[PDB]
Write an enzyme that holds these catalytic residues in place. Sequence first.
Site, PDB file in Angstrom:
ATOM      1  N   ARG A 275       2.126   2.352 -11.165  1.00  0.00           N
ATOM      2  CA  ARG A 275       2.227   0.891 -11.286  1.00  0.00           C
ATOM      3  C   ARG A 275       1.994   0.378 -12.689  1.00  0.00           C
ATOM      4  O   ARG A 275       2.730  -0.472 -13.227  1.00  0.00           O
ATOM      5  CB  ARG A 275       1.195   0.277 -10.358  1.00  0.00           C
ATOM      6  CG  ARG A 275       1.542   0.487  -8.920  1.00  0.00           C
ATOM      7  CD  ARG A 275       0.439  -0.159  -8.048  1.00  0.00           C
ATOM      8  NE  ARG A 275       0.482   0.296  -6.643  1.00  0.00           N
ATOM      9  CZ  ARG A 275      -0.316  -0.156  -5.684  1.00  0.00           C
ATOM     10  NH1 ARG A 275      -1.264  -1.086  -5.944  1.00  0.00           N
ATOM     11  NH2 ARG A 275      -0.183   0.361  -4.468  1.00  0.00           N
ATOM     12  N   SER A 276       0.989   0.946 -13.369  1.00  0.00           N
ATOM     13  CA  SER A 276       0.826   0.615 -14.769  1.00  0.00           C
ATOM     14  C   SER A 276       2.043   0.884 -15.613  1.00  0.00           C
ATOM     15  O   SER A 276       2.337   0.152 -16.549  1.00  0.00           O
ATOM     16  CB  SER A 276      -0.325   1.429 -15.399  1.00  0.00           C
ATOM     17  OG  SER A 276      -1.526   0.916 -14.787  1.00  0.00           O
TER      18      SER A 276
ATOM     19  N   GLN B 292       5.597   7.223 -11.184  1.00  0.00           N
ATOM     20  CA  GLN B 292       5.122   8.346 -10.395  1.00  0.00           C
ATOM     21  C   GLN B 292       6.046   8.760  -9.260  1.00  0.00           C
ATOM     22  O   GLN B 292       5.879   9.854  -8.676  1.00  0.00           O
ATOM     23  CB  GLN B 292       3.720   8.012  -9.792  1.00  0.00           C
ATOM     24  CG  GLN B 292       2.599   8.037 -10.855  1.00  0.00           C
ATOM     25  CD  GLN B 292       1.210   7.881 -10.187  1.00  0.00           C
ATOM     26  OE1 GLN B 292       0.788   6.773  -9.932  1.00  0.00           O
ATOM     27  NE2 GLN B 292       0.523   8.978  -9.921  1.00  0.00           N
TER      28      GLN B 292
ATOM     29  N   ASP C 265       0.787  -1.257   0.000  1.00  0.00           N
ATOM     30  CA  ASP C 265       0.000   0.000   0.000  1.00  0.00           C
ATOM     31  C   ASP C 265       0.794   1.268   0.000  1.00  0.00           C
ATOM     32  O   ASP C 265       0.302   2.320  -0.388  1.00  0.00           O
ATOM     33  CB  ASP C 265      -0.936   0.052   1.194  1.00  0.00           C
ATOM     34  CG  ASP C 265      -2.123  -0.815   0.988  1.00  0.00           C
ATOM     35  OD1 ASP C 265      -2.334  -1.295  -0.166  1.00  0.00           O
ATOM     36  OD2 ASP C 265      -2.837  -1.030   1.972  1.00  0.00           O
TER      37      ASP C 265
ATOM     38  N   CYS D 274      -4.145   1.049 -13.205  1.00  0.00           N
ATOM     39  CA  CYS D 274      -3.994   1.046 -11.752  1.00  0.00           C
ATOM     40  C   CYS D 274      -4.879   2.129 -11.220  1.00  0.00           C
ATOM     41  O   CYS D 274      -6.042   2.132 -11.557  1.00  0.00           O
ATOM     42  CB  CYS D 274      -2.537   1.228 -11.289  1.00  0.00           C
ATOM     43  SG  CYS D 274      -1.669   2.581 -12.163  1.00  0.00           S
TER      44      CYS D 274
END
EC number: 3.1.3.48
Length: 281
Positions: free
Chosen positions: A219-220, A260, A179, A213
Amino acid sequence: MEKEFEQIDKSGSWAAIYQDIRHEASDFPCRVAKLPKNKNRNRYRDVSPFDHSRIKLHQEDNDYINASLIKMEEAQRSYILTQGPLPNTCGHFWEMVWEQKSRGVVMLNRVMEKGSLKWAQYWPQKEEKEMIFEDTNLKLTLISEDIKSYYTVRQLELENLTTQETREILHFHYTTWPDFGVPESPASFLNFLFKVRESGSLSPEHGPVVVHCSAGIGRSGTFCLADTCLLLMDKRKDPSSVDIKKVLLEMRKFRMGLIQTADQLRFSYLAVIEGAKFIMG
Ligand SMILES: [Mg+2]
């Protein structure tokens, strides 16, 4: 390319390299994403598709979805990167899957974001409770689900209710990205990538894989970036010449913001490095 990784670590310069990327990254208009009529089709004000690479929905009303085609010419692979669907855009999401002839969907977020709030559930939780998207005239059925320790693969049946044509879509959901932060080992993420490859979902015989995502950029971006760099290492005379920073800038010509955080950038390098060692053998 592993010693360079070791040099960036020793140097502590992940943030610097990451900011060089944000700085060098392309800037293209997103005029359609920014029209007042599409505000409610964007999950995040600061993540929009460029006009040049956005996916256009075919039906009549409004062709906008927050989704971009990333077309990697040299690797010969395409991906569509899109935000997690909103309650009002699940119909559009599957219409895009149908129209683009995608065989797979790859999800890297949690639908219960951290412990906060469940996001729109865009596939059926139970076989007996199929979903019908009234606006795009599609029916979606859960056929099977296989829960593994680090990912879940579902087989879905998507039907175009206009023609009654039916297609099997494979949904790959990676369930163990922490997370906060990034996995300490890229082994389960790589295994997940290789499962998606094995399924045939990324074959050029199909439409592009739909990857998402939360915003479809972090994450993508890691999934698409690791996949492409591994393809290039396998395709080039000199697998040595693959520069992950250049590949990412290339991807960023098609969708803003891919990768990111500096920690995600380092994790992407690490996954390509470990992937190569594995695919090297
Ligand atoms: Mg049941």
